[PDB]
RNA sequence: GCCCGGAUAGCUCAGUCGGUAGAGCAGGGGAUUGAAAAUCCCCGUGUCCUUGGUUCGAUUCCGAGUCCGGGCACCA
RNA sequence: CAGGCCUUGACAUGCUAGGGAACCCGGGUGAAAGCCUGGGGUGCCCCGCGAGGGGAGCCCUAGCACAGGUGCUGCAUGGC
């Protein structure tokens, strides 16, 4: 039944889009539009997305009709030979799956996960040292490889930051939808009574993008004045024009510097200085563009889980599908296809 | 190639073709229709047999036209031969096909019509040309 | 930019006449603990900054360099 | 766990149909399981010597009601 999920995950995707062609394969009759050397590619790129969008409804139905026609599960010739025919008829079904999952905008390079934990204290962090484990084997079964950029312990039990670093094909994009606080409920070992109780603990990730460190103001775009010294000085502070002024226009920064009795180891030396504000100016803002591409869920407070692991009745409770699976110990092995197989879709299902 | 003043020579597909994809809006532009290309059309696509068909269009402004049909492009009669489906990103020496001797003059009983010359041989070293066109080697 | 001092275990610093390399903390394996500390025995632990030369061998002595820290940049 | 097979099934119970009602040695094929398959013949209720089949065991296959699970919960429980 593994395909009656996927199979109709894109018969959803016919009629949504399927009347939409005919609003667009009805400008392109018409040469009066073409007048627009924009408005006229525009459209021819909806007019070519009938590409993937009339291939598929095609060749889907047939993998529907080639297999639900001479299919006795009872060993036979006529029958167990048509397995074969739909094995790579439905190895190929995968085409529309990562056509959900290499869609991101950055589903390419490595991701980054920073696990801290949250509410639950003490237990919370042992909360994060599971999770951790949770997802290094996840991504060393599919292939993928690690890179332990920090971890450290703490006081009680558990731990108090771990951030990682894993690399394999199309890695971003399946650690994506694990984003966000995860909740889980067991007997607390550092209890007495051994209460039920809850923890909480954030899991972020980030692609690994921008790199380099560089930063050259090529004196393109600089205004560079000198004025008359100022202060003391003799009979040359009010001949030399010693001060300079180096002026930013594209930021309105301007530095000045008298420091010396030179111009040309003050306007320099004025330059020493607009490139560090700069820098710091111009990283400020790598503070603020990279702390809204991540998200905003983060919390860890009580009410905000996108997924609940318990082991206590056991069972793992993805409240972001409405899917409540009953093998939480299996999961916390690296198993995560399946949520993910669910976190790809309610994530990238409203875009 | 037909006569001027409103015509458009395209390579039809095989089979089926009446929505926008391939060219079914383009020979629009230029006046058309849905209804007089599309099933009153693959009469000859059905004879044609498949792959490629590079019938044309000729315009005059009535729903009329001169489907003057074709022989597949030489640029695909040769991935039979050989075996290929595209021919390469870029000829010359090397090419993900092959053509023996004799092979290109098994187009021979393909291409005699327009090519220029009634006989075989003086009309297949043209396709021994698409050879160092698309690629495809010639076994010799 | 001028002159002077530096850079040595992962952190902060001792050291050699040129032929070892060291400390304290951290970190790794045990011990106590019900369990974390503290405590407790066992330990790893270096292209001695880049680079060239001197030499039988240079971390060491030399000329240049990168970076860091100080004292100067005065009479107009 | 990997691979090759089986579905009322390894087992209980009731029931359904033409079969069938104790039943016995193999042949072929495969790694085995299993799929397939080559012969003896049913005391008997006994209208009855007979054709026949009522026939108790009761095996064979299809069908039904169900079976099955060292799958989860030892903070749902018994017992120990
Ligand atoms: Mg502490
Ligand atoms: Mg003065
Ligand atoms: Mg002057
Ligand atoms: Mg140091
Ligand atoms: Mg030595
Ligand atoms: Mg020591
Ligand atoms: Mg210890
Ligand atoms: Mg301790
Ligand atoms: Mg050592
Ligand atoms: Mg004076
Ligand atoms: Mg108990």
Same mark, same amino acid.
């Given at each position: 039944?593994?395909?009656?999920?996927?199979?109709?995950?894109?018969?959803?995707?016919?009629?949504?889009?399927?009347?939409?062609?005919?609003?667009?394969?009805?400008?392109?009759?018409?040469?009066?539009?073409?007048?627009?050397?924009?408005?006229?590619?525009?459209?021819?790129?909806?007019?070519?997305?009938?590409? $993937?969008?009339?291939?598929?409804?095609?060749?889907?139905?047939?993998?529907?009709?080639?297999?639900?026609?001479?299919?006795?599960?009872?060993?036979?010739?006529?029958?167990?030979?048509?397995?074969?025919? &739909?094995?790579?008829?439905?190895?190929?079904?995968?085409?529309?799956?990562?056509?959900?999952?290499?869609?991101?905008?950055?589903?390419?390079?490595?991701?980054?996960?920073?696990?801290?934990?949250?509410?639950?204290?003490?237990?919370?962090?042992?909360?994060?040292?599971?999770?951790?484990?949770?997802?290094?084997?996840?991504?060393? $079964?599919?292939?993928?490889?690690?890179?332990?950029?920090?971890?450290?312990?703490?006081?009680?039990?558990?731990?108090?930051?771990? /951030?990682?670093?894993?690399?394999?094909?199309?890695?971003?994009?399946?650690?994506?939808?694990?984003?966000?606080?995860?909740?889980?409920?067991?007997?607390?070992?550092?209890?007495?009574?051994?209460?039920?109780?809850?923890?909480?603990?954030?899991?972020?990730?980030?692609?690994?993008?921008?790199?380099? %460190?560089?930063?050259?103001?090529?004196?393109?775009?600089?205004?560079?004045?000198?004025?008359?010294?100022?202060? !003391?000085?003799?009979?040359? %502070?009010?001949?030399?024009?010693?001060?300079?002024?180096?002026?930013?226009? !594209?930021?309105?920064?301007?530095?000045?510097?008298?420091?010396?009795?030179?111009?040309?180891?003050?306007?320099?030396?004025? &330059?020493?200085?607009?490139?560090?504000?700069?820098?710091?100016?111009?990283?400020?803002?790598?503070?603020?563009?990279?702390?809204?591409?991540?998200?905003?869920?983060?919390?860890?407070?009580?009410?905000? /889980?996108?997924?609940?692991?318990?082991?206590?009745?056991?069972? %793992?409770?993805?409240?972001?599908?409405? &899917?409540?699976?009953?093998?939480?110990?299996? %999961? &916390?092995?690296?198993?995560?296809?399946?949520?993910?197989?669910?976190?790809?879709?309610?994530?990238?299902?409203?875009? | 190639?037909?006569?001027?003043?409103?015509?458009?020579?395209?390579?039809?597909?095989?089979?089926?073709?009446? #929505?926008?994809? #391939?060219?079914? #809006?383009?020979?629009?532009?230029?006046?058309? +229709?849905?209804?007089? @290309?599309?099933?009153? @059309? +693959?009469?000859?696509?059905?004879?044609?047999?498949?792959?490629?068909? #590079?019938?044309?269009?000729?315009?005059?402004?009535?729903?009329?036209?001169? @489907?003057?049909?074709?022989?597949?492009?030489?640029?695909?009669?040769?991935?039979?031969?050989?075996?290929?489906?595209?021919?390469?990103?870029?000829?010359?020496? *090397?090419?993900?096909?092959?053509?023996?001797?004799?092979?290109?003059?098994?187009?021979?009983?393909?291409?005699?019509?327009?090519?220029?010359?009634?006989?075989? *041989?003086?009309?297949?070293?043209?396709?021994?040309?698409?050879?160092?066109?698309?690629?495809? *080697?010639?076994?010799?």
């Amino acid at each position: 039944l593994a395909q009656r999920l996927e199979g109709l995950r894109g018969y959803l995707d016919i009629p949504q889009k399927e009347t939409r062609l005919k609003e667009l394969e009805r400008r392109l009759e018409d040469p009066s539009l073409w007048n627009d050397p924009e408005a006229a590619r525009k459209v021819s790129q909806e007019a070519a997305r009938l590409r $993937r969008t009339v291939d598929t409804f095609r060749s889907l139905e047939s993998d529907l009709q080639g297999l639900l026609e001479l299919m006795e599960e009872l060993p036979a010739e006529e029958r167990e030979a048509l397995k074969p025919e &739909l094995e790579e008829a439905a190895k190929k079904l995968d085409e529309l799956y990562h056509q959900t999952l290499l869609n991101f905008p950055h589903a390419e390079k490595n991701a980054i996960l920073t696990i801290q934990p949250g509410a639950g204290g003490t237990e919370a962090c042992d909360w994060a040292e599971m999770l951790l484990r949770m997802y290094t084997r996840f991504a060393e $079964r599919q292939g993928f490889q690690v890179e332990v950029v920090d971890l450290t312990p703490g006081p009680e039990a558990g731990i108090d930051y771990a /951030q990682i670093l894993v690399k394999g094909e199309n890695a971003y994009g399946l650690l994506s939808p694990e984003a966000g606080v995860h909740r889980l409920v067991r007997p607390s070992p550092f209890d007495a009574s051994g209460r039920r109780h809850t923890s909480f603990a954030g899991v972020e990730v980030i692609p690994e993008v921008d790199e380099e %460190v560089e930063v050259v103001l090529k004196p393109e775009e600089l205004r560079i004045d000198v004025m008359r010294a100022s202060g !003391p000085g003799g009979q040359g %502070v009010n001949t030399t024009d010693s001060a300079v002024r180096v002026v930013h226009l !594209p930021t309105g920064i301007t530095v000045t510097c008298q420091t010396t009795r030179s111009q040309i180891k003050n306007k320099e030396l004025a &330059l020493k200085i607009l490139k560090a504000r700069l820098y710091e100016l111009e990283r400020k803002k790598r503070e603020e563009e990279l702390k809204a591409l991540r998200g905003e869920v983060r919390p860890i407070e009580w009410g905000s /889980q996108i997924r609940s692991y318990v082991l206590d009745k056991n069972y %793992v409770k993805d409240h972001r599908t409405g &899917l409540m699976r009953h093998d939480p110990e299996n %999961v &916390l092995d690296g198993d995560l296809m399946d949520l993910i197989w669910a976190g790809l879709e309610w994530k990238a299902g409203r875009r | 190639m037909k006569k001027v003043v409103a015509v458009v020579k395209l390579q039809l597909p095989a089979g089926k073709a009446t #929505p926008a994809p #391939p060219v079914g #809006p383009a020979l629009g532009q230029h006046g058309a +229709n849905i209804m007089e @290309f599309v099933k009153a @059309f +693959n009469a000859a696509t059905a004879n044609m047999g498949d792959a490629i068909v #590079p019938v044309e269009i000729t315009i005059y402004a009535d729903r009329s036209f001169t @489907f003057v049909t074709k022989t597949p492009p030489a640029s695909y009669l040769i991935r039979k031969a050989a075996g290929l489906e595209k021919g390469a990103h870029k000829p010359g020496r *090397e090419k993900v096909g092959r053509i023996t001797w004799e092979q290109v003059l098994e187009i021979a009983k393909q291409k005699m019509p327009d090519l220029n010359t009634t006989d075989l *041989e003086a009309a297949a070293r043209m396709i021994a040309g698409s050879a160092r066109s698309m690629g495809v *080697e010639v076994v010799g």
